[PDB]
Design an enzyme around this catalytic site. Structure first.
Site, PDB file in Angstrom:
ATOM      1  NE  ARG A 187      -5.599 -12.554  -7.049  1.00  0.00           N
ATOM      2  CZ  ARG A 187      -4.883 -13.204  -6.132  1.00  0.00           C
ATOM      3  NH1 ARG A 187      -4.027 -14.158  -6.478  1.00  0.00           N
ATOM      4  NH2 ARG A 187      -5.020 -12.894  -4.845  1.00  0.00           N
ATOM      5  CG  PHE A 225       7.270 -23.572   2.037  1.00  0.00           C
ATOM      6  CD1 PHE A 225       6.120 -23.527   2.809  1.00  0.00           C
ATOM      7  CD2 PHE A 225       8.086 -22.452   1.990  1.00  0.00           C
ATOM      8  CE1 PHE A 225       5.815 -22.379   3.551  1.00  0.00           C
ATOM      9  CE2 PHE A 225       7.797 -21.326   2.731  1.00  0.00           C
ATOM     10  CZ  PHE A 225       6.649 -21.289   3.503  1.00  0.00           C
ATOM     11  CE1 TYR A 238       0.981  -1.915   3.025  1.00  0.00           C
ATOM     12  CE2 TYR A 238       1.129  -3.179   0.967  1.00  0.00           C
ATOM     13  CZ  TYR A 238       0.507  -2.901   2.171  1.00  0.00           C
ATOM     14  OH  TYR A 238      -0.599  -3.631   2.520  1.00  0.00           O
ATOM     15  NE  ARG A 272      -8.554  -4.512   1.000  1.00  0.00           N
ATOM     16  CZ  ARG A 272      -9.732  -5.131   1.056  1.00  0.00           C
ATOM     17  NH1 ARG A 272     -10.587  -4.893   2.044  1.00  0.00           N
ATOM     18  NH2 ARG A 272     -10.055  -6.014   0.119  1.00  0.00           N
TER      19      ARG A 272
END
Ligand code: NI
EC number: 2.5.1.21
Length: 335
Positions: free
Chosen positions: A184, A254, A137, A194
């Site tokens: 978290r 980044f 997933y 969910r």
């Protein structure tokens, strides 16, 4: 220096990334527009996947063929009821700019969209069972983002070919962020119906994932929390390896900023009952500090090592994962 359409794309980037937008906008040269467009395409795809007002029978065709809408100049989607729906309603503007990218960037972005659409669609009905299924997933919704980014960096030649080649390390970058978010966000996800915590893990503790929200279950909940955090920590050696190979400053920033944010977050959540009572966040000043300092390898390593130390000395002898948590941390520290 921006066309009308690119102006709009960056506006959307700011609406949907908040910042991250500034870090994307600081990317050198050709990387900037490539990453901006990749991010928007992903946001459109995720907006479809998230939208519970779209039936499964309507949603799967959109997911499966999303990659092909990039080459359909007039394709837009007008029926979304999600926060970022403007990127779907104005998709023609995004796809126009996509088709203005160098072909080498188009190939990567299209390939990742195709692969992600298929994977997202596979998970629409089912929840996550095994730890292997958790990794699958996470690969679909996040690992592939890391892989795609890494391929864009190598293609631009601002980074070495190795970055785009090593799909395993690129995948770990994504899995670490996604597992951290999933951990978290237990309670936020619960309240939204969910379920992302893997069943092979939580069913060793409670009969239903929702049972972790019950105060009589706090001890079991924290044990499960600590088990999942331990799982996520296994990605940190790959994150360090990945970061260590970057030679472009704007790419390094980044890449490093979200990872140091994720580690600070895991450190905050570890053995923390408040995970099941609210959203544990990094204290605002500290978050900006880590962002501001996450700028070279010695600095990032020092940061990760400090957070690993804070976890290590919080590990309860009585935790069922205590031995494993100590071992991964010792492994991370000695790299
Ligand atoms: Ni199909």
């Amino acid at each position: 220096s921006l066309s009308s359409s690119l102006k709009t794309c960056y506006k959307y980037l700011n609406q949907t990334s908040r910042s991250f937008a500034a870090v994307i906008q600081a990317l050198d040269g050709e990387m900037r527009n490539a990453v901006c467009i990749f991010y928007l395409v992903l946001r459109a795809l995720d907006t479809l996947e998230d939208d519970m007002t779209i039936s499964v029978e309507k949603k799967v065709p959109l997911l499966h063929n999303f990659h092909s809408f990039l080459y359909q100049p007039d394709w837009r989607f007008m029926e979304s009821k999600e926060k970022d729906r403007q990127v779907l309603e104005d998709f023609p503007t995004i796809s126009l700019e996509f088709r203005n990218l160098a072909e080498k960037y188009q190939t990567v972005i299209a390939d990742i969209c195709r692969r992600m659409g298929i994977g997202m669609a596979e998970f629409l009905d089912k929840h996550v069972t095994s730890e292997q299924e958790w990794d699958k997933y996470c690969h679909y919704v996040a690992g592939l983002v890391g892989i795609g980014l890494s391929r864009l960096f190598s293609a631009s030649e601002f980074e070495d070919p190795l970055v785009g080649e090593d799909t395993e390390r690129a995948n770990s970058m994504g899995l670490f962020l996604q597992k951290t978010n999933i951990i978290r966000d237990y309670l936020e996800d619960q309240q939204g119906g969910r379920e992302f915590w893997p069943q092979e893990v939580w069913s060793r503790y409670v009969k239903k994932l929702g049972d972790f929200a019950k105060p009589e279950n706090i001890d079991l909940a924290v044990q499960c929390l600590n088990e999942l955090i331990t799982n996520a920590l296994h990605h940190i050696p790959d994150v360090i390896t990945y970061l260590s190979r970057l030679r472009n400053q704007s790419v390094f920033n980044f890449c490093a900023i979200p990872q140091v944010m994720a580690i600070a977050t895991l450190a905050a959540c570890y053995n923390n009952q408040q995970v099941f009572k609210g959203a544990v966040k990094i204290r605002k000043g500290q978050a900006v500090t880590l962002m501001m300092d996450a700028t070279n390898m010695p600095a990032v390593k020092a940061i990760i090592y400090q957070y690993m130390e804070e976890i290590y000395h919080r590990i309860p002898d009585s935790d069922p994962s205590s031995s494993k948590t100590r071992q991964i941390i010792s492994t991370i520290r000695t790299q």
